[PDB]
A paper describes a structure:
One of the main functions of RAB GTPases is to recruit actin- or MT- based motors on transport carriers, allowing them to move along cytoskeletal tracks. This is the case for [name], the most abundant RAB at the Golgi that regulates several transport steps at the Golgi as well as Golgi homeostasis. Two closely related [name] isoforms, [name] and [name]′ are present on Golgi/TGN membranes. The interaction between [name] and Myosin II is critical for the fission of [name]-positive transport carriers from Golgi/TGN membranes. Here, we show that [name] is also involved in the fission process.
Author numbering:
A (entry chain C): 600 to 648
B (entry chain A): 11 to 176
C (entry chain D): 600 to 646
D (entry chain B): 14 to 55, 59 to 175
Write the structure that this text describes.
Protein backbone atom coordinates (compact mmCIF):
# COMPACT_ATOMS: atom_id res chain seq x y z
CA UNK A 1 0.00 0.00 0.00
CA UNK A 2 1.20 3.48 0.94
CA UNK A 3 3.53 2.14 3.64
CA UNK A 4 5.24 -0.31 1.29
CA UNK A 5 5.61 2.34 -1.41
CA UNK A 6 7.16 4.87 0.97
CA UNK A 7 9.80 2.41 2.18
CA UNK A 8 10.48 1.14 -1.33
CA UNK A 9 11.27 4.71 -2.37
CA UNK A 10 13.69 5.21 0.53
CA UNK A 11 15.27 1.78 -0.01
CA UNK A 12 15.75 2.62 -3.68
CA UNK A 13 17.37 5.97 -2.89
CA UNK A 14 19.80 4.38 -0.44
CA UNK A 15 20.69 1.69 -2.98
CA UNK A 16 21.19 4.32 -5.67
CA UNK A 17 23.48 6.51 -3.57
CA UNK A 18 25.56 3.66 -2.13
CA UNK A 19 25.98 2.27 -5.65
CA UNK A 20 27.20 5.69 -6.77
CA UNK A 21 29.63 6.02 -3.86
CA UNK A 22 31.16 2.55 -4.10
CA UNK A 23 31.34 2.41 -7.90
CA UNK A 24 33.35 5.62 -7.67
CA UNK A 25 35.62 3.97 -5.09
CA UNK A 26 36.16 0.97 -7.37
CA UNK A 27 36.98 3.23 -10.31
CA UNK A 28 39.42 5.41 -8.35
CA UNK A 29 40.99 2.30 -6.82
CA UNK A 30 41.48 0.82 -10.28
CA UNK A 31 43.01 4.02 -11.69
CA UNK A 32 45.27 4.53 -8.67
CA UNK A 33 46.58 0.95 -8.67
CA UNK A 34 47.16 1.15 -12.42
CA UNK A 35 48.95 4.51 -12.28
CA UNK A 36 50.93 3.41 -9.22
CA UNK A 37 52.27 0.15 -10.67
CA UNK A 38 52.77 1.38 -14.25
CA UNK A 39 55.32 3.94 -13.04
CA UNK A 40 57.29 1.21 -11.26
CA UNK A 41 57.09 -0.94 -14.39
CA UNK A 42 58.07 2.01 -16.60
CA UNK A 43 61.17 2.77 -14.51
CA UNK A 44 62.49 -0.76 -14.90
CA UNK A 45 61.49 -0.79 -18.58
CA UNK A 46 63.57 2.36 -19.09
CA UNK A 47 66.57 0.26 -18.06
CA UNK A 48 67.34 -1.53 -21.35
CA UNK A 49 70.98 -0.40 -21.37
CA UNK B 1 18.58 9.79 -15.82
CA UNK B 2 18.10 6.16 -14.78
CA UNK B 3 21.32 4.15 -14.50
CA UNK B 4 21.98 0.74 -16.05
CA UNK B 5 24.96 -1.60 -15.77
CA UNK B 6 26.48 -3.37 -18.78
CA UNK B 7 29.09 -6.07 -18.18
CA UNK B 8 31.29 -7.17 -21.09
CA UNK B 9 32.37 -10.81 -21.10
CA UNK B 10 34.39 -13.17 -23.28
CA UNK B 11 37.75 -14.82 -23.83
CA UNK B 12 40.98 -12.87 -24.13
CA UNK B 13 41.49 -10.53 -27.08
CA UNK B 14 38.04 -11.00 -28.66
CA UNK B 15 37.50 -7.23 -28.75
CA UNK B 16 35.48 -6.30 -25.65
CA UNK B 17 37.50 -3.15 -24.99
CA UNK B 18 37.66 -2.17 -28.67
CA UNK B 19 33.86 -2.34 -28.98
CA UNK B 20 33.49 0.00 -26.00
CA UNK B 21 36.17 2.34 -27.35
CA UNK B 22 34.53 2.49 -30.79
CA UNK B 23 31.17 3.31 -29.22
CA UNK B 24 32.48 5.87 -26.76
CA UNK B 25 35.06 7.72 -28.87
CA UNK B 26 34.55 6.41 -32.41
CA UNK B 27 38.18 5.29 -32.56
CA UNK B 28 40.17 2.07 -32.80
CA UNK B 29 43.68 0.94 -31.87
CA UNK B 30 45.39 -2.10 -33.41
CA UNK B 31 47.85 -2.24 -30.51
CA UNK B 32 46.71 -4.81 -27.97
CA UNK B 33 46.44 -3.68 -24.36
CA UNK B 34 45.02 -6.48 -22.23
CA UNK B 35 42.40 -5.45 -19.68
CA UNK B 36 43.76 -5.87 -16.17
CA UNK B 37 41.00 -7.22 -13.96
CA UNK B 38 38.27 -4.78 -14.95
CA UNK B 39 37.71 -1.23 -16.20
CA UNK B 40 34.83 1.12 -15.41
CA UNK B 41 33.39 3.58 -17.92
CA UNK B 42 30.20 5.60 -18.26
CA UNK B 43 28.11 6.94 -21.15
CA UNK B 44 24.75 8.65 -21.44
CA UNK B 45 22.33 7.66 -24.21
CA UNK B 46 19.63 10.20 -25.05
CA UNK B 47 16.87 7.90 -26.30
CA UNK B 48 13.61 9.19 -27.78
CA UNK B 49 11.74 8.00 -24.69
CA UNK B 50 14.16 9.15 -21.99
CA UNK B 51 17.83 9.48 -21.06
CA UNK B 52 19.82 6.62 -19.54
CA UNK B 53 23.35 6.47 -18.14
CA UNK B 54 25.21 3.28 -19.00
CA UNK B 55 27.86 2.05 -16.60
CA UNK B 56 30.20 -0.04 -18.73
CA UNK B 57 32.01 -2.83 -16.88
CA UNK B 58 34.81 -4.06 -19.13
CA UNK B 59 36.16 -7.35 -17.73
CA UNK B 60 39.40 -9.17 -18.57
CA UNK B 61 39.63 -12.35 -20.62
CA UNK B 62 42.82 -13.40 -18.81
CA UNK B 63 42.11 -16.54 -16.79
CA UNK B 64 43.75 -15.18 -13.64
CA UNK B 65 41.05 -12.50 -13.31
CA UNK B 66 38.05 -14.85 -13.67
CA UNK B 67 37.29 -14.80 -9.93
CA UNK B 68 36.56 -11.05 -10.07
CA UNK B 69 33.78 -11.35 -12.62
CA UNK B 70 30.84 -13.10 -10.87
CA UNK B 71 29.94 -10.16 -8.59
CA UNK B 72 29.77 -7.82 -11.59
CA UNK B 73 27.58 -10.24 -13.54
CA UNK B 74 25.43 -10.44 -10.42
CA UNK B 75 25.02 -6.66 -10.21
CA UNK B 76 24.63 -6.05 -13.97
CA UNK B 77 21.49 -5.22 -15.96
CA UNK B 78 22.93 -6.36 -19.28
CA UNK B 79 25.57 -8.90 -20.25
CA UNK B 80 27.38 -8.46 -23.55
CA UNK B 81 29.12 -11.71 -24.42
CA UNK B 82 31.75 -11.31 -27.12
CA UNK B 83 33.59 -13.80 -29.29
CA UNK B 84 35.99 -13.55 -32.21
CA UNK B 85 34.65 -14.87 -35.53
CA UNK B 86 38.21 -15.93 -36.43
CA UNK B 87 38.63 -18.01 -33.26
CA UNK B 88 36.48 -21.10 -32.71
CA UNK B 89 37.48 -21.57 -29.07
CA UNK B 90 36.25 -18.09 -28.18
CA UNK B 91 32.89 -18.94 -29.76
CA UNK B 92 32.67 -22.35 -28.08
CA UNK B 93 33.21 -20.70 -24.68
CA UNK B 94 30.19 -18.39 -25.06
CA UNK B 95 27.81 -21.14 -23.90
CA UNK B 96 29.81 -21.22 -20.66
CA UNK B 97 29.69 -17.43 -20.37
CA UNK B 98 25.93 -17.32 -20.93
CA UNK B 99 25.57 -20.23 -18.51
CA UNK B 100 27.37 -18.15 -15.86
CA UNK B 101 25.18 -15.11 -16.55
CA UNK B 102 21.94 -17.08 -16.20
CA UNK B 103 23.32 -18.68 -13.03
CA UNK B 104 23.69 -15.25 -11.40
CA UNK B 105 20.65 -13.48 -12.87
CA UNK B 106 18.31 -16.06 -14.41
CA UNK B 107 15.83 -14.59 -16.89
CA UNK B 108 16.03 -11.16 -15.24
CA UNK B 109 18.95 -10.20 -17.49
CA UNK B 110 19.35 -8.93 -21.03
CA UNK B 111 22.02 -10.83 -22.95
CA UNK B 112 23.63 -9.90 -26.26
CA UNK B 113 25.92 -12.34 -28.07
CA UNK B 114 28.48 -10.55 -30.26
CA UNK B 115 30.54 -12.06 -33.08
CA UNK B 116 33.34 -9.50 -33.48
CA UNK B 117 36.08 -8.89 -36.11
CA UNK B 118 33.96 -9.37 -39.26
CA UNK B 119 36.59 -7.36 -41.16
CA UNK B 120 38.98 -10.32 -40.91
CA UNK B 121 36.93 -12.08 -43.57
CA UNK B 122 39.45 -14.64 -44.84
CA UNK B 123 40.24 -15.75 -41.28
CA UNK B 124 36.63 -16.45 -40.34
CA UNK B 125 36.03 -19.85 -38.75
CA UNK B 126 32.56 -19.21 -37.31
CA UNK B 127 29.82 -18.62 -39.88
CA UNK B 128 27.20 -16.00 -39.11
CA UNK B 129 24.67 -18.86 -39.25
CA UNK B 130 26.43 -20.72 -36.42
CA UNK B 131 26.40 -17.60 -34.27
CA UNK B 132 22.73 -16.96 -34.96
CA UNK B 133 21.80 -20.57 -34.19
CA UNK B 134 23.69 -20.44 -30.88
CA UNK B 135 21.99 -17.22 -29.80
CA UNK B 136 18.58 -18.64 -30.67
CA UNK B 137 19.34 -21.86 -28.79
CA UNK B 138 20.13 -19.80 -25.70
CA UNK B 139 17.40 -17.20 -26.28
CA UNK B 140 19.80 -14.26 -26.41
CA UNK B 141 20.14 -11.36 -28.83
CA UNK B 142 22.74 -11.67 -31.59
CA UNK B 143 24.83 -9.33 -33.71
CA UNK B 144 28.08 -9.38 -35.66
CA UNK B 145 30.42 -6.40 -35.47
CA UNK B 146 33.76 -4.94 -36.43
CA UNK B 147 35.19 -2.57 -33.85
CA UNK B 148 37.94 -1.86 -36.37
CA UNK B 149 35.66 -0.98 -39.29
CA UNK B 150 33.04 0.57 -37.03
CA UNK B 151 30.49 -1.90 -38.36
CA UNK B 152 27.34 -2.50 -36.30
CA UNK B 153 28.82 -1.14 -33.06
CA UNK B 154 26.22 1.62 -32.79
CA UNK B 155 23.54 -0.93 -33.67
CA UNK B 156 24.79 -3.18 -30.86
CA UNK B 157 24.29 -0.51 -28.21
CA UNK B 158 21.00 0.77 -29.65
CA UNK B 159 19.52 -2.73 -29.57
CA UNK B 160 20.69 -3.19 -25.99
CA UNK B 161 19.37 0.22 -24.92
CA UNK B 162 15.97 -0.44 -26.52
CA UNK B 163 15.64 -3.63 -24.45
CA UNK B 164 16.29 -1.90 -21.11
CA UNK B 165 13.44 -2.02 -18.55
CA UNK B 166 11.07 0.94 -18.30
CA UNK C 1 6.62 5.87 15.14
CA UNK C 2 5.98 2.28 14.08
CA UNK C 3 6.44 3.17 10.41
CA UNK C 4 9.75 4.97 10.91
CA UNK C 5 11.09 2.11 13.03
CA UNK C 6 10.18 -0.51 10.43
CA UNK C 7 11.81 1.34 7.54
CA UNK C 8 14.89 2.21 9.59
CA UNK C 9 15.38 -1.49 10.29
CA UNK C 10 15.29 -2.35 6.59
CA UNK C 11 17.48 0.61 5.61
CA UNK C 12 20.05 -0.38 8.24
CA UNK C 13 20.04 -3.94 6.93
CA UNK C 14 20.32 -2.88 3.28
CA UNK C 15 23.20 -0.56 4.16
CA UNK C 16 25.02 -3.29 6.09
CA UNK C 17 24.71 -5.78 3.23
CA UNK C 18 25.78 -3.36 0.50
CA UNK C 19 28.77 -2.35 2.61
CA UNK C 20 29.74 -6.03 2.89
CA UNK C 21 29.29 -6.65 -0.84
CA UNK C 22 31.20 -3.62 -2.10
CA UNK C 23 34.06 -3.95 0.37
CA UNK C 24 34.50 -7.53 -0.85
CA UNK C 25 34.70 -6.17 -4.41
CA UNK C 26 37.30 -3.59 -3.41
CA UNK C 27 39.34 -6.15 -1.50
CA UNK C 28 39.48 -8.83 -4.19
CA UNK C 29 40.02 -6.24 -6.93
CA UNK C 30 43.01 -4.83 -5.06
CA UNK C 31 44.40 -8.29 -4.30
CA UNK C 32 44.09 -9.39 -7.93
CA UNK C 33 45.87 -6.31 -9.31
CA UNK C 34 48.55 -6.43 -6.60
CA UNK C 35 49.42 -10.07 -7.30
CA UNK C 36 49.54 -9.40 -11.05
CA UNK C 37 51.67 -6.25 -10.95
CA UNK C 38 54.10 -7.65 -8.38
CA UNK C 39 54.90 -10.56 -10.70
CA UNK C 40 55.41 -8.02 -13.48
CA UNK C 41 57.75 -5.98 -11.26
CA UNK C 42 59.58 -9.15 -10.20
CA UNK C 43 60.17 -10.11 -13.83
CA UNK C 44 61.75 -6.72 -14.50
CA UNK C 45 63.68 -7.06 -11.23
CA UNK C 46 64.88 -10.56 -12.12
CA UNK C 47 66.49 -9.02 -15.21
CA UNK D 1 32.38 1.73 15.64
CA UNK D 2 34.67 2.36 12.66
CA UNK D 3 38.28 3.48 13.20
CA UNK D 4 40.29 5.00 10.35
CA UNK D 5 44.09 5.15 10.60
CA UNK D 6 45.65 8.18 8.92
CA UNK D 7 49.18 9.50 8.54
CA UNK D 8 52.21 9.88 6.31
CA UNK D 9 54.06 6.95 4.79
CA UNK D 10 55.95 4.51 7.03
CA UNK D 11 54.84 6.05 10.35
CA UNK D 12 53.57 2.71 11.70
CA UNK D 13 49.82 2.69 11.03
CA UNK D 14 49.76 -0.95 9.91
CA UNK D 15 52.23 -2.05 12.60
CA UNK D 16 50.02 -0.62 15.35
CA UNK D 17 47.01 -2.49 13.98
CA UNK D 18 49.00 -5.71 13.53
CA UNK D 19 50.34 -5.42 17.08
CA UNK D 20 46.84 -4.95 18.49
CA UNK D 21 45.24 -7.56 16.23
CA UNK D 22 47.79 -10.37 16.13
CA UNK D 23 50.46 -9.27 18.62
CA UNK D 24 53.07 -9.54 15.88
CA UNK D 25 55.52 -7.11 14.32
CA UNK D 26 57.58 -7.08 11.13
CA UNK D 27 60.73 -5.00 10.66
CA UNK D 28 60.43 -5.34 6.89
CA UNK D 29 58.49 -2.47 5.33
CA UNK D 30 55.43 -3.27 3.21
CA UNK D 31 53.67 -0.08 2.14
CA UNK D 32 49.89 -0.27 2.40
CA UNK D 33 48.16 -0.26 -0.98
CA UNK D 34 44.79 1.47 -1.10
CA UNK D 35 42.78 0.77 2.05
CA UNK D 36 42.60 -2.46 4.07
CA UNK D 37 39.83 -3.51 6.46
CA UNK D 38 39.99 -5.44 9.73
CA UNK D 39 37.65 -6.29 12.62
CA UNK D 40 38.12 -7.35 16.25
CA UNK D 41 36.63 -7.82 19.73
CA UNK D 42 38.07 -6.63 23.06
CA UNK D 43 34.06 -4.71 30.20
CA UNK D 44 31.76 -4.81 27.17
CA UNK D 45 31.30 -6.30 23.70
CA UNK D 46 33.77 -4.32 21.61
CA UNK D 47 32.96 -4.27 17.88
CA UNK D 48 36.00 -2.57 16.35
CA UNK D 49 36.04 -2.07 12.58
CA UNK D 50 39.47 -0.84 11.48
CA UNK D 51 40.32 0.91 8.22
CA UNK D 52 44.04 0.94 7.44
CA UNK D 53 44.87 3.57 4.82
CA UNK D 54 47.92 4.09 2.61
CA UNK D 55 50.41 6.86 3.33
CA UNK D 56 51.36 6.83 -0.35
CA UNK D 57 50.17 9.96 -2.14
CA UNK D 58 48.74 7.99 -5.07
CA UNK D 59 45.96 6.60 -2.85
CA UNK D 60 45.10 9.78 -0.92
CA UNK D 61 41.93 10.44 -2.93
CA UNK D 62 40.44 7.16 -1.68
CA UNK D 63 40.53 8.21 1.96
CA UNK D 64 37.91 11.00 2.41
CA UNK D 65 34.85 8.73 2.13
CA UNK D 66 36.20 6.44 4.85
CA UNK D 67 36.78 9.34 7.24
CA UNK D 68 33.11 10.30 6.87
CA UNK D 69 31.91 6.89 8.05
CA UNK D 70 34.57 6.55 10.75
CA UNK D 71 33.47 7.52 14.26
CA UNK D 72 37.13 7.59 15.30
CA UNK D 73 40.21 8.95 13.54
CA UNK D 74 43.68 7.78 14.59
CA UNK D 75 46.27 10.18 13.19
CA UNK D 76 49.76 8.73 13.42
CA UNK D 77 53.19 10.27 13.08
CA UNK D 78 56.75 9.05 13.56
CA UNK D 79 58.65 10.64 16.45
CA UNK D 80 61.87 10.23 14.45
CA UNK D 81 60.48 12.26 11.54
CA UNK D 82 59.48 15.88 12.09
CA UNK D 83 57.73 16.16 8.70
CA UNK D 84 55.37 13.30 9.59
CA UNK D 85 54.48 15.27 12.72
CA UNK D 86 53.91 18.56 10.89
CA UNK D 87 51.55 16.89 8.41
CA UNK D 88 49.21 15.65 11.17
CA UNK D 89 47.76 19.17 11.28
CA UNK D 90 46.54 18.71 7.71
CA UNK D 91 45.25 15.21 8.50
CA UNK D 92 43.31 16.42 11.53
CA UNK D 93 41.89 19.36 9.56
CA UNK D 94 40.56 16.91 6.98
CA UNK D 95 38.95 14.81 9.72
CA UNK D 96 37.19 17.96 10.94
CA UNK D 97 36.08 18.81 7.39
CA UNK D 98 34.37 15.41 7.13
CA UNK D 99 33.14 14.99 10.72
CA UNK D 100 33.42 18.36 12.47
CA UNK D 101 33.18 18.01 16.25
CA UNK D 102 31.23 14.73 16.24
CA UNK D 103 34.42 12.68 15.91
CA UNK D 104 36.91 11.16 18.33
CA UNK D 105 40.49 11.95 17.30
CA UNK D 106 43.66 10.40 18.71
CA UNK D 107 47.06 11.83 17.79
CA UNK D 108 49.71 9.10 17.97
CA UNK D 109 53.46 9.63 18.22
CA UNK D 110 54.80 6.21 17.24
CA UNK D 111 58.24 4.52 17.48
CA UNK D 112 59.17 5.61 21.02
CA UNK D 113 61.75 2.81 21.03
CA UNK D 114 63.89 4.70 18.51
CA UNK D 115 65.01 7.08 21.26
CA UNK D 116 68.35 7.78 19.54
CA UNK D 117 66.49 9.04 16.47
CA UNK D 118 63.74 11.07 18.13
CA UNK D 119 63.23 14.39 16.33
CA UNK D 120 59.93 15.30 18.02
CA UNK D 121 59.67 15.75 21.80
CA UNK D 122 56.70 14.41 23.74
CA UNK D 123 56.06 18.03 24.79
CA UNK D 124 55.64 19.05 21.14
CA UNK D 125 53.12 16.26 20.59
CA UNK D 126 51.18 17.12 23.73
CA UNK D 127 51.12 20.77 22.67
CA UNK D 128 49.74 20.03 19.20
CA UNK D 129 47.03 17.82 20.68
CA UNK D 130 45.95 20.59 23.06
CA UNK D 131 46.06 23.19 20.28
CA UNK D 132 43.95 21.03 17.95
CA UNK D 133 41.81 19.66 20.79
CA UNK D 134 42.44 15.95 20.23
CA UNK D 135 43.61 13.05 22.39
CA UNK D 136 47.33 12.22 22.54
CA UNK D 137 49.48 9.15 23.13
CA UNK D 138 53.00 7.96 22.28
CA UNK D 139 53.50 4.35 21.21
CA UNK D 140 55.91 1.67 20.08
CA UNK D 141 54.28 -0.90 17.80
CA UNK D 142 57.57 -2.81 17.92
CA UNK D 143 57.67 -3.03 21.72
CA UNK D 144 53.89 -3.06 22.06
CA UNK D 145 54.10 0.05 24.24
CA UNK D 146 50.76 1.83 24.75
CA UNK D 147 49.17 -0.03 21.83
CA UNK D 148 46.59 -1.61 24.14
CA UNK D 149 46.02 1.76 25.84
CA UNK D 150 45.56 3.46 22.48
CA UNK D 151 42.54 1.29 21.67
CA UNK D 152 41.22 1.16 25.25
CA UNK D 153 41.33 4.96 25.50
CA UNK D 154 39.70 5.38 22.08
CA UNK D 155 37.05 2.78 22.94
CA UNK D 156 36.12 4.50 26.20
CA UNK D 157 35.38 7.67 24.21
CA UNK D 158 32.86 6.02 21.88
CA UNK D 159 29.23 7.22 22.18
N1 LIG E 1 40.84 -6.81 -37.19
C1 LIG E 1 40.19 -6.51 -36.07
N2 LIG E 1 40.87 -6.48 -34.87
C2 LIG E 1 40.20 -6.18 -33.73
C3 LIG E 1 38.84 -5.90 -33.74
N3 LIG E 1 38.46 -5.64 -32.47
C4 LIG E 1 39.55 -5.74 -31.66
N4 LIG E 1 40.63 -6.07 -32.43
C5 LIG E 1 42.03 -6.30 -32.01
O1 LIG E 1 42.11 -7.46 -31.21
C6 LIG E 1 43.00 -7.25 -30.13
C7 LIG E 1 42.19 -7.43 -28.86
O2 LIG E 1 41.28 -6.36 -28.74
P1 LIG E 1 40.74 -5.95 -27.29
O3 LIG E 1 39.62 -4.94 -27.44
O4 LIG E 1 41.85 -5.43 -26.40
O5 LIG E 1 40.18 -7.37 -26.79
P2 LIG E 1 39.68 -7.65 -25.29
O6 LIG E 1 38.53 -8.62 -25.38
O7 LIG E 1 39.28 -6.36 -24.60
O8 LIG E 1 40.96 -8.38 -24.61
P3 LIG E 1 41.09 -8.63 -23.02
O9 LIG E 1 40.71 -7.36 -22.30
O10 LIG E 1 42.53 -8.97 -22.71
O11 LIG E 1 40.21 -9.77 -22.59
C8 LIG E 1 43.55 -5.84 -30.27
O12 LIG E 1 44.81 -5.87 -30.91
C9 LIG E 1 42.56 -5.15 -31.17
O13 LIG E 1 43.15 -4.15 -31.97
C10 LIG E 1 38.15 -5.93 -34.94
O14 LIG E 1 36.94 -5.69 -35.00
N5 LIG E 1 38.84 -6.24 -36.10
N1 LIG F 1 61.60 0.75 15.55
C1 LIG F 1 60.31 0.77 15.24
N2 LIG F 1 59.91 0.57 13.94
C2 LIG F 1 58.59 0.59 13.63
C3 LIG F 1 57.63 0.83 14.59
N3 LIG F 1 56.42 0.79 13.99
C4 LIG F 1 56.60 0.55 12.67
N4 LIG F 1 57.95 0.42 12.44
C5 LIG F 1 58.64 0.16 11.16
O1 LIG F 1 58.41 1.25 10.28
C6 LIG F 1 58.19 0.79 8.96
C7 LIG F 1 56.81 1.29 8.55
O2 LIG F 1 55.83 0.57 9.27
P1 LIG F 1 54.34 0.51 8.69
O3 LIG F 1 53.40 0.00 9.76
O4 LIG F 1 54.27 -0.33 7.44
O5 LIG F 1 54.04 2.06 8.40
P2 LIG F 1 52.70 2.54 7.65
O6 LIG F 1 52.24 3.85 8.24
O7 LIG F 1 51.60 1.52 7.76
O8 LIG F 1 53.20 2.75 6.13
P3 LIG F 1 52.19 3.08 4.92
O9 LIG F 1 51.08 2.06 4.91
O10 LIG F 1 53.01 3.06 3.66
O11 LIG F 1 51.59 4.45 5.12
C8 LIG F 1 58.29 -0.72 9.00
O12 LIG F 1 59.58 -1.13 8.57
C9 LIG F 1 58.12 -1.08 10.45
O13 LIG F 1 58.86 -2.23 10.79
C10 LIG F 1 58.03 1.04 15.91
O14 LIG F 1 57.20 1.25 16.80
N5 LIG F 1 59.36 1.01 16.22
MG1 LIG G 1 39.86 -5.65 -22.73
MG1 LIG H 1 50.49 0.58 6.16
Amino acid sequence: GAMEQWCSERLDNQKELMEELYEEKLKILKESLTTFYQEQIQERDEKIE
Amino acid sequence: LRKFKLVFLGEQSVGKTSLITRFMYDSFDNTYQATIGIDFLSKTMYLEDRTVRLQLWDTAGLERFRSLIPSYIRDSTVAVVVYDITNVNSFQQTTKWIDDVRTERGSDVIIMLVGNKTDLADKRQVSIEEGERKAKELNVMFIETSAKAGYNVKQLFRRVAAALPG
